[PDB]
């Protein structure tokens, strides 16, 4: 009687003034904050 | 009697002044904040 | 008597002044904040 | 005289017998191949 | 006279018998190949 | 006269019998190949 189990568990985030936040994987692009000429 | 289980679990986010937020996977593009000429 | 279960769980988001927010997968485009000439 | 340019470029994919393929932002779910009881 | 440029460039993929392939941002889930009871 | 440039460059991939392939940001889950009871 093979039992299995998993739990990705409890998280919590409190953020403020955050230009970017999260997970990406691949970026061939340009996550620019501000350009000027 | 093979039992299984999973739980992606409890989360919470409190954000403010956040130009971008979340998950992407792939970006071949251009996540620009501001361009000027 | 094989039991299974899943729960994608409880979330909550409170946001303000957020140019973009959410999940994308693929971007071949251009998520521009502001262009000027 | 401000020139810009971008090119997400040229790609090619040849696949076979591929249970899943592509880009995902977030998965709180269960991309299972096969369950049995 | 401010010039800019970008090029995410030229790619090629040839695959076969690939249970999963691509880019992921976040997985709170379960990308299982095969479960049995 | 401020010039800039970028080039994410030229790539090539030739694969076969590859259970998983690509880029991941976060995994709180379970990228299992095969479970048995």
Numbering used by the authors:
A (entry chain B), B (entry chain B), C (entry chain B), D (entry chain A), E (entry chain A), F (entry chain A): 1 to 37
What does the paper say about this structure?
We also determined the cryo-EM structure of Aβ filaments from the brains of AppNL−G−F mice to 3.5 Å resolution. Filaments are made of two identical S-shaped mutant protofilaments that extend from D1 to G37 of Aβ. Each protofilament consists of five β-strands that extend from residues 1 to 8, 10 to 16, 17 to 19, 30 to 32 and 34 to 36. Additional densities around K16 may be co-factors or post-translational modifications of mutant Aβ, but their chemical identity remains unknown. The N-terminal segment (residues D1–F19) is longer than in human Arctic folds A and B, allowing it to fold back on the common substructure and extend across the dimeric interface towards the other protofilament. Both protofilaments pack against each other with pseudo-21 symmetry. In addition, there are salt bridges between E11 and K28, and close contacts of the side chains of H6 and S8 with the backbone atoms of G29 and K28, respectively. It shares the substructure F20–G37 with human Arctic folds A and B, in which the backbone conformation of the loop F20–V24 differs from human Arctic folds in that the orientation of the peptide group between A21 and G22 is reversed.
The Arctic mutation, encoding E693G in the amyloid precursor protein (APP) gene [E22G in amyloid-β (Aβ)], causes dominantly inherited Alzheimer’s disease. In summary, we report the structures of Aβ filaments from a case of AD with the Arctic mutation and from mouse knock-in line AppNL−G−F. These findings have implications for our understanding of AD pathophysiology. Comparison of local conformations in this region revealed the presence of additional hydrogen bonds between adjacent Aβ molecules in mutant protofilaments; these hydrogen bonds cannot form in wild-type protofilaments, providing a plausible explanation for the increased fibrillogenesis of E22G Aβ. Mutation E22G may have an additional fibrillation-promoting effect, which is the relief of electrostatic repulsion as a result of removal of the negatively charged carboxylic group of E22; in the wild-type structure, E22 is trapped in close proximity to the carboxylic group of D23.
